[PDB]
C-alpha cells in the first residue's frame, strides 16, 4: 500500500535564558528514523533506527548544518509572530513546522505538505494543489498574502515533487 | 535531504 515521509520541526521559547530549544524529528511512514535536539551537549544529528547507519559521514554532516540554519529561521520567526499577535517579549511560545510527501506504490507523489502551528493552533498550510494556502486567522493572512505574491508554493514544490520522493524511496529501500 | 530554507512568516 501507500507510504510517507514527514519532518516535524519544533522551537520553544525559554524565559530569559538565551536561545529557544530546537527539535527536528523525521518519520518514515509513521516510524521515527531520525532526530535532532539542540539541548544535547553536542547537538549534531543522529540515527534512530539501525538501517540508517549505512549513510555516509557527508550525509550526517550536511544534514546537521541544515538544522543549525533552521534554528535561525525559528529564532527570527518566533519574533515576528510576537509582532503579528501583539504579544509580550517576556513570554514563551511554540512554533512547529511540518513538511513531507505521500506516495503509494505508483512510485509517484500523492500529496505534499508545508504547514505551521503556533502554540498548538493551526497557522498556515499548503493546500493539496500546492498553489494555494489555508490561513487560520488575521496574522496568518498577512503571511498568506505575501506567500501568494512571492510564489512560495512554487518554491516548496521543487522539493516536494523532486527530492522528497527520491529520498523517501532511498530510505524505503532499507529494512 | 531536507527541504530548502523555508519562507519567512
Amino acid at each position, epitope marked *: 500500500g501507500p507510504h510517507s515521509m514527514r519532518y516535524y520541526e519544533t522551537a520553544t521559547s525559554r524565559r530569559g535564558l538565551g536561545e529557544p530549544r530546537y527539535t527536528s524529528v523525521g518519520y518514515v511512514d509513521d516510524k521515527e528514523f531520525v532526530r535532532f535536539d539542540s539541548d544535547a551537549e553536542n547537538p549534531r544529528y543522529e540515527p534512530q533506527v539501525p538501517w540508517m547507519e549505512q549513510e555516509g559521514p557527508e550525509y550526517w554532516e550536511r544534514i546537521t548544518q541544515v538544522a543549525k540554519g533552521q534554528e535561525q529561521w525559528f*529564532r527570527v520567526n518566533l519574533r515576528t509572530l510576537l509582532g503579528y499577535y501583539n504579544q509580550s517579549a517576556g513570554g514563551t511560545h511554540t512554533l512547529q513546522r511540518m513538511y513531507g510527501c505521500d506516495v503509494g506504490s505508483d512510485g509517484r507523489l500523492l500529496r505534499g505538505y508545508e504547514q505551521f502551528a503556533y502554540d498548538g493552533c493551526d497557522y498556515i498550510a499548503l493546500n493539496e494543489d500546492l498553489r494555494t494556502w489555508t490561513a487560520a486567522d488575521m496574522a496568518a493572512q498577512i503571511t498568506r498574502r505575501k506567500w501568494e505574491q512571492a510564489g512560495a508554493a*512554487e518554491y516548496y*514544490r521543487a522539493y516536494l515533487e523532486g527530492e522528497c520522493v527520491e529520498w523517501l524511496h532511498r530510505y524505503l529501500k532499507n529494512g | 535531504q531536507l527541504s530548502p530554507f523555508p519562507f519567512d512568516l
Partner: single-chain antibody
Amino acid sequence: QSVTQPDARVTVSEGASLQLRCKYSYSATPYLFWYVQYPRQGPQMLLKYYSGDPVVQGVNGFEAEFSKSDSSFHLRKASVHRSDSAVYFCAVSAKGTGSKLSFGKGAKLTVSPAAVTQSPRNKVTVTGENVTLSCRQTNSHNYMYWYRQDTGHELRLIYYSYGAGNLQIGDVPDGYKATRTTQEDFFLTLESASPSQTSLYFCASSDAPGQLYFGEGSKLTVLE
C-alpha cells in the same frame, strides 16, 4: 557554478523584438532571476523562476522561458521602447543557498530611435579615511545585503544578513566590516579606505529567496 550572458553589448531598433540570452552551468537546477538597471538606479527585479510553469511573466512587459535540457533562461520583449535602454542582468540563486543572489556579467541594451534608503549618495575621500555607508529599510524584510558594482560590471556581494546581529560573508568581503544593528539598519564600514574600494555600493533587502529590493546607490571614490 556560473551564469553566462553571451553579449555584453546589444543594439536593437525601437519597436523591434528583443531576446537576451542566458545560460547557466550548475550541478542542481538553481533559482533563476532577471534584473534591470536603469542609469543612476539600483537593479529592479523583472521576473523570477522557482519551479512549475517554465514560462514566466515579468514586469514592464518582459517574459522569460526556462529550459532544463538547454540549461537556459532567456529574456524577451515583443516591442522595445526607448525607455528600455538599460543594463540587463541574468541572475541566479544556488539551490542550497536560496537567498544568496549572484549576478551574470550583464547586457547593455541600446534601443535607438524598493523602500531601501542608503545615506550617502556620493562621497569622495582620501586613502586611510574611515567611511561608513548607512542603509535603512522599512519593509520588515529579514534579509539585507551590501553589494558593490565597479562601473561597467555587475553587482558583487560583500556581506549579507538574516535578522538583527547576523553576518554572513559574500564573495568579496576583504577590507569591509558590516553590522546589522537592528532589523531595519545595515551599516557597511571601510576602516581604512583604499583606492581599490572606489565603486558604486548598493544596499538591498529581501523577503523571498533571491527577490531583492535595491537602494539607490552610494558612489564612493577614494583617492591616493
